[PDB]
Amino acid sequence: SFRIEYDTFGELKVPNDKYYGAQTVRSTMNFKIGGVTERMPTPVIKAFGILKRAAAEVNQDYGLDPKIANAIMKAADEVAEGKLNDHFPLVVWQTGSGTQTNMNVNEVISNRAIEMLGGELGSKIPVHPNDRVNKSQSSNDTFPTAMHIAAAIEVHEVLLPGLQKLHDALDAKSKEFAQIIKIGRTHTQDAVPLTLGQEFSGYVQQVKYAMTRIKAAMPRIYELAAGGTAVGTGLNTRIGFAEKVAAKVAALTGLPFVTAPNKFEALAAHDALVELSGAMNTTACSLMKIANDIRFLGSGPRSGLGELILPENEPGSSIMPGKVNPTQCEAMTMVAAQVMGNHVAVTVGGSNGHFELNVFKPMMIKNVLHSARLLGDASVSFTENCVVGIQANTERINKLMNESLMLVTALNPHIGYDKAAKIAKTAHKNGSTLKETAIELGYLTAEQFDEWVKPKDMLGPK
Amino acid sequence: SFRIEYDTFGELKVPNDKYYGAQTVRSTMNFKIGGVTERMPTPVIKAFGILKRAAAEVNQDYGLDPKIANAIMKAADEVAEGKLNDHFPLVVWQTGSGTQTNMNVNEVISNRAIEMLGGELGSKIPVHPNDRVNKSQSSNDTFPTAMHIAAAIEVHEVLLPGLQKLHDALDAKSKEFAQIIKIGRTHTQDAVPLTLGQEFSGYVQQVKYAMTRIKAAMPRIYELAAGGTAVGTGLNTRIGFAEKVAAKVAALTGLPFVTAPNKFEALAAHDALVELSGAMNTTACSLMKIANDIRFLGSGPRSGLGELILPENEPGSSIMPGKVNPTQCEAMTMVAAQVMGNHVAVTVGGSNGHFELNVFKPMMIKNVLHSARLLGDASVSFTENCVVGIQANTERINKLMNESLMLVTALNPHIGYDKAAKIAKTAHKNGSTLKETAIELGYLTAEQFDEWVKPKDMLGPK
Amino acid sequence: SFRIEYDTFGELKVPNDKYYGAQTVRSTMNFKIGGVTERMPTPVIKAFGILKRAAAEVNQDYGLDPKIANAIMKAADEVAEGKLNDHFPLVVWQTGSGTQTNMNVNEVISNRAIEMLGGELGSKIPVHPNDRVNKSQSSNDTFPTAMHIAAAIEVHEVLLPGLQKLHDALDAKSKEFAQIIKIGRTHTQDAVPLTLGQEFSGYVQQVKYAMTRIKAAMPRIYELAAGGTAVGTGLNTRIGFAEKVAAKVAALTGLPFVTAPNKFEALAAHDALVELSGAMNTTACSLMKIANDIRFLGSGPRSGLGELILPENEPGSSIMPGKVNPTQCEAMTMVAAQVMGNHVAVTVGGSNGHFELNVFKPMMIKNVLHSARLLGDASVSFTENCVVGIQANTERINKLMNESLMLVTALNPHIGYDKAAKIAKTAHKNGSTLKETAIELGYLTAEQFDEWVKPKDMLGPK
Amino acid sequence: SFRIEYDTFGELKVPNDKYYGAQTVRSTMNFKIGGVTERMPTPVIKAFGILKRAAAEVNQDYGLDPKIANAIMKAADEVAEGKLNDHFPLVVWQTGSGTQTNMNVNEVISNRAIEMLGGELGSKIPVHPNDRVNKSQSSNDTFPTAMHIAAAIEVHEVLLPGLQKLHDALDAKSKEFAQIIKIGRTHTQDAVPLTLGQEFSGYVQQVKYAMTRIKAAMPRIYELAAGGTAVGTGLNTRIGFAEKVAAKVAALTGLPFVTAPNKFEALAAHDALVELSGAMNTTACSLMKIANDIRFLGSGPRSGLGELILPENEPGSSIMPGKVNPTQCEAMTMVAAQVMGNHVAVTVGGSNGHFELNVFKPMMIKNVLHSARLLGDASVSFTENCVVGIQANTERINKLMNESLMLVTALNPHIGYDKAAKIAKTAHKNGSTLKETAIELGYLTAEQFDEWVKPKDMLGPK
């Protein structure tokens, strides 16, 4: 069931159905931290596939036999395509350079390329893990490159598409609610009117601005460290390798990757990941507000605010009509809190580089990808299972507009401030409406009230 | 105007009306970071006065002349009593060991004692700042001792008394509201009843637990670094000085200070400050919940929840009866947010010690004292200006109870499930009460509803 | 391959090899957030097994048929024993009360108990998920109970045992290094001596204190919410149920669980989880310092500090003798940063309760358990793969003690301060040792130096 | 002594020498939280002066009498110029909309203008605080406008200039050290060479990227809330006032302020402050790395790394040549830790808006201004008192290069791998240099070593 390989510490059994080798087995023994939920994120593994395929193709310019390079490229493609995910058992909590995962990737690509070429597994023949798959590379500049490839692809494919769907659904709900006037709330106290459409347009702007902030963090993510080798000098690498690898990754991905102009900055720090996390942290603040507002605006049916009817996600009860838990609001605000915590973990790691190498890399990229996926996935779920189904409770909104004390200020140009306050004071004391009170005191008629108090004239400057 | 003092780098102008000297002027030239709001917290300065008073009294056992010791003690007392606060211009953002503030204290006490002895300011005759005021002490073990003295005093005099007042005021309201039944809220949806007294009793328990948590953090704060000297060994101090100065501090303050049993832990780390900040961080979460709940329970007057009437302390508008902004809730929840951020500042500093000395000391104690003072002061203000005057809106509460759809389950034993549901569903569609609808459907009589639906019976297990 | 079940939204296929039902299937469709690394932690699932077994046994006092109760107890035991982990596919990012996981647990326990009794899967006969497995319970008080059971077991079995091993290994290394004198470092500058044993005793004290802080957070974790039902009143539950369930959980676990004295505080907030996270946050600060110190003390072989020889964890190179990457230091400091971020996520959730129910529960317990397991697992790994193998580089330590300028202060009682400084100044200028310089200037003999400069006399007070 | 003013709650003693009035005295009575270090930041007060000056000039278009407008403008100018700072006693911990400070500003400007018009202080004649100084404005849109004005000015005048000085000083050192070769460090282990110039160029790039990140956060800060009034609709302000007052602020400041295109987003949230704090958070991570590296590179003189000689700004001990504490590194890394905590405070506040108004405004702007000022001031101090005077310890660097085992790979083409390894292994065991050992083993000549081992050739790709 197993073959036998060796490292400098002793003999190791490797399962015959596995493409990794002795270094990866030793690593599962030396880094038993946290269990399977801690495995290196698949976007990192796939990004390594993209990177090893670009390096193999470029290394033909520097003496790599095309037959060996072609097998490496095909094997790297299978990694990048997600066909070999089961051959990566290592956790985030390894060396802070990600060396063990670089070797896991070199081992798997070598053994699969060996198999494609007819050799025997575990043999290093004819594709040596370090000499061929890791040719012209270091763990020090490859893991950072994989981080930025994975981050950019996840932003492009998961995070922004999720936010875009949320933006568009909130914008639709904003135009659908454009004529529904409700009582505003400041300090949670009753305030002057605005439309539900206006209130929702604020959410739309926040999501639009979140997308812009995330996009503004991407140019530094597109800088790749490949070619910095061990300490950033590019020692033991060939001239032009850095530019060529980056240009190859860009063509493979369709994204504007470039080589980092300063490889010392690219190896000794991950400030671009701190900044991207910062943009997700702002996004989480925006989404906390939007989701918590929608939560409260749907509270009720009778002892809450009751402006919105949220779609049911849980089984409703026949005995409990109108009760709807805001389920997606809760998942989303829990996600928002997680992103804020992830951002502090990214910050602590990003602040703790030493000399030529920051060695917090796996934890930093784990937290960035975790926030990116949570935000994108929750944005989709919140859209499809809550926002698109939101309805306005117009009867309750209309009833509360008539019962509000806030519109009393439309009477001042007609009967004077002092008589307006007496109406408001009296209605507040008696629990009556402004209209009932304004008439019961003989200050005006019902026809005068209905003509002077028009909330649709209280929604803008004059 | 000025006098002239000298250090080994040249001449310095010292204001004649100031008790500090050359080293302190030099320190103000080198650390112009942030302005006057960044001055070293007065509790640290006073704690330094206590410590120097204790050292001078104890140092009589080790050769210090009693007439010199007496003037040092009297000057140090003035520092500890807050009488010389204007003679400390240095900011938090100085050396990470606090050496500049230690020198500031030595100079101020030296010069004030020289003045009491009839000497000339700046003269070092006959009270030398380092050889007599800093006798048996080091740069490195004095500031951490002052940190723990200041934190213990602030916890004892400001933080716990403020929380005690808040606990007692919430408990009185809990008892005052013990019979007022309202509709519960889970997920912000209407839920089964509880009293305002029960809900407030949750707040009371939270504040009680906060006080226990803070008290649980004090035993390690009572351990003092004095006697560790430069690196923790006690080199260049006298045997027994560590224990004697801790006991003298205990007798001067009435708090159970002892010498730290491991001086390397006490100099190389400030884990006790991190743990005390963490207890305040939990307190902040509790206060955030309490204040935000009271904020929303007082929302209205007509488009909110309207269960509580909060005291109006700042005049409002005559045209706006019933509109009262929950301004003390806002001060308190802002303070809570600040404590959470301060806690992360404390954490980063506490995580970053190097070898024998943590050199983030001034910023860690600044954030701990800041949090303690804000929490204590806001608790007093929130108590006196909001909690003690809260009234229940019993009329609105009673009406909302009658309009709730939640109570409809008390009718299950009497008319079966299927009829109650039809009442709930029909009331929900018509906007009428459960009682109106059960009568209009002829499923029971008014007197039957009033005898079957008793919220008083829905407040406990059976 | 599948059976057919229904909920109020439509027909659902349930795999026949799965013990969950339609509610769980619907939940995997409604909460597609984050993928499989986001699954509810297994310690929560097992804790639910303990809880449903205690409730079933107690519910016999309240009309539960013993035959049905016995099948429920056996099925709950299989959940608690980890035999049914594959039947829980739901993610953390569900409703904030954990309702979906409560139903997942009720469904799986019902179907497995049905199978034990001979019935057909998916039928609810004879063990109804809600009426029997959820009898006398609410999602609102069960998920909090499972959180605290899981937290206490993880602290007892993973976190503290890991820290204890680390404490004991550091204490052994401290006694083994008790006679090795080295140069201290303050501000990272050379300082007076202390032994490696003394420096390591500081680490030992930090870990001892971390264990005490964690233990001080457990009494509030041992308070269980079971019996609070929907809003904390205990409505729809039987008198004595809360005390009996808690006493049963305590007997099943061997841990001192008790019923929460105030169920409103237990449902509306999770301040005990915030406080336990706070204790882990302090622990992370302590471990960051210890691991980073050991990292730097092992730096070299020639351009670093070079006091410690760390055991190899990576394949060493023949060309690179003495180069050893501090692999476990990096995994541990990365873990420490993660705990600090997790703590902020716990804090944000803990601060955001609303009225009767905090609905951030799954994210809060996820982060607490994640920090607890990471800290315990990394503590074991750091112990076995680094601490127990640490050796002192005594030749380099001894060589640097002889080259240090720091010991020049042992000459002052013999040749006076002024002549001591001239030796230090001259050796610093020439790059020579104090001994060479003190002799070359004719201030003393080699025999006088060797007798007056004894670092073993510079390790304590006099 | 005092004069007497009145609000609707009674009589208030106002100091005769103060320009504030009844509302401000009332505010000091109700918000005694934290003491004088908690006063509203002077940049907010000055920004309010700019805003009130702009509003008064624009309000001439809307009826304001030019002679009244002129005195308001002149008084508001004195506020903006920092001439009336003593007339603002209110703390940050006030209403979450900043209303008290808005009233403080209105009263101070009203009374100073009344004084210029020859009236009596407290009289409201002829400059009414709310009817003329607050004309066309609201409580709710003035404070957020002042926040953004203050943040933009502080970024432009303090933060970016400080970072610019640090960037330029690091770049000059980079060029000064361009030819000094030293041993690299990865994982803190010895690594292949790089120049001090290359390493410092990484720092330069980090500071350059920090400045770009901060600049990228300013476009949303330039959007002003003025004109949103109470809830965002602009009710009770004039058409065109929003655009005109933003343009007047732009012309007064020379910064590209514009009116916010969505006033609901601008009042309900402060996402732009969260994003600006996040850019400063990234800056803090960069500065932490730079300062901590320089801290350790200057460690010694003999038991550290010893590559850099840092300026000695505070006198040391004559008995301790070469011992220089990196005190500016400590101030800077403490500041970095503080910015990270401030950022979490900003995040919590920014996440907690409610409906039409975020009421965490004073604490959010306080933390943003605090971070900006600390970063700017510390950058200037770190530059002038450390960076500009750093010297390389070329003699020690050259010796460490010669004693390194890293260079041994240049001998591979000339004597093969196996002989070089035996040299490295033997030098490592004997404590001798690579050159001494290769000669003593007779594998090459001294002149052969000097020609084969050229570190100048190991600094780049080939």
Curated annotation (Swiss-Prot), chains A, B, C, D:
<dbReference type="GO" id="GO:0048873">
    <property type="term" value="P:homeostasis of number of cells within a tissue"/>
</dbReference>
<feature type="modified residue" description="N6-succinyllysine">
    <location>
        <position position="419"/>
    </location>
</feature>
<feature type="modified residue" description="N6-succinyllysine; alternate">
    <location>
        <position position="244"/>
    </location>
</feature>
<keyword id="KW-0597">Phosphoprotein</keyword>
<dbReference type="GO" id="GO:0000821">
    <property type="term" value="P:regulation of arginine metabolic process"/>
</dbReference>
<dbReference type="GO" id="GO:0006974">
    <property type="term" value="P:DNA damage response"/>
</dbReference>
<dbReference type="InterPro" id="IPR000362">
    <property type="entry name" value="Fumarate_lyase_fam"/>
</dbReference>
<feature type="modified residue" description="N6-acetyllysine">
    <location>
        <position position="46"/>
    </location>
</feature>
<feature type="modified residue" description="Phosphothreonine">
    <location>
        <position position="37"/>
    </location>
</feature>
<feature type="modified residue" description="Phosphoserine">
    <location>
        <position position="318"/>
    </location>
</feature>
<dbReference type="InterPro" id="IPR008948">
    <property type="entry name" value="L-Aspartase-like"/>
</dbReference>
<feature type="modified residue" description="Phosphothreonine; by PRKDC">
    <location>
        <position position="188"/>
    </location>
</feature>
<dbReference type="GO" id="GO:0042393">
    <property type="term" value="F:histone binding"/>
</dbReference>
<dbReference type="GO" id="GO:0006281">
    <property type="term" value="P:DNA repair"/>
</dbReference>
<dbReference type="GO" id="GO:0006108">
    <property type="term" value="P:malate metabolic process"/>
</dbReference>
<feature type="modified residue" description="N6-succinyllysine; alternate">
    <location>
        <position position="18"/>
    </location>
</feature>
<dbReference type="GO" id="GO:0005694">
    <property type="term" value="C:chromosome"/>
</dbReference>
<comment type="similarity">
    <text>Belongs to the class-II fumarase/aspartase family. Fumarase subfamily.</text>
</comment>
<feature type="modified residue" description="N6-acetyllysine; alternate">
    <location>
        <position position="18"/>
    </location>
</feature>
<feature type="modified residue" description="N6-acetyllysine; alternate">
    <location>
        <position position="13"/>
    </location>
</feature>
<keyword id="KW-0227">DNA damage</keyword>
<comment type="pathway">
    <text>Carbohydrate metabolism; tricarboxylic acid cycle; (S)-malate from fumarate: step 1/1.</text>
</comment>
<keyword id="KW-0539">Nucleus</keyword>
<dbReference type="GO" id="GO:0005829">
    <property type="term" value="C:cytosol"/>
</dbReference>
<comment type="function">
    <text>Catalyzes the reversible stereospecific interconversion of fumarate to L-malate. Experiments in other species have demonstrated that specific isoforms of this protein act in defined pathways and favor one direction over the other.</text>
</comment>
<keyword id="KW-0043">Tumor suppressor</keyword>
<dbReference type="Pfam" id="PF10415">
    <property type="entry name" value="FumaraseC_C"/>
</dbReference>
<feature type="modified residue" description="N6-succinyllysine; alternate">
    <location>
        <position position="67"/>
    </location>
</feature>
<keyword id="KW-0456">Lyase</keyword>
<dbReference type="InterPro" id="IPR005677">
    <property type="entry name" value="Fum_hydII"/>
</dbReference>
<keyword id="KW-0496">Mitochondrion</keyword>
<feature type="modified residue" description="N6-acetyllysine">
    <location>
        <position position="208"/>
    </location>
</feature>
<dbReference type="GO" id="GO:0005737">
    <property type="term" value="C:cytoplasm"/>
</dbReference>
<feature type="active site" description="Proton donor/acceptor">
    <location>
        <position position="187"/>
    </location>
</feature>
<feature type="binding site">
    <location>
        <begin position="97"/>
        <end position="99"/>
    </location>
    <ligand>
        <name>substrate</name>
    </ligand>
</feature>
<feature type="binding site">
    <location>
        <begin position="138"/>
        <end position="140"/>
    </location>
    <ligand>
        <name>substrate</name>
    </ligand>
</feature>
<keyword id="KW-0234">DNA repair</keyword>
<feature type="modified residue" description="N6-succinyllysine; alternate">
    <location>
        <position position="13"/>
    </location>
</feature>
<dbReference type="GO" id="GO:0005759">
    <property type="term" value="C:mitochondrial matrix"/>
</dbReference>
<feature type="modified residue" description="N6-acetyllysine; alternate">
    <location>
        <position position="175"/>
    </location>
</feature>
<feature type="site" description="Important for catalytic activity">
    <location>
        <position position="330"/>
    </location>
</feature>
<feature type="modified residue" description="N6-succinyllysine; alternate">
    <location>
        <position position="175"/>
    </location>
</feature>
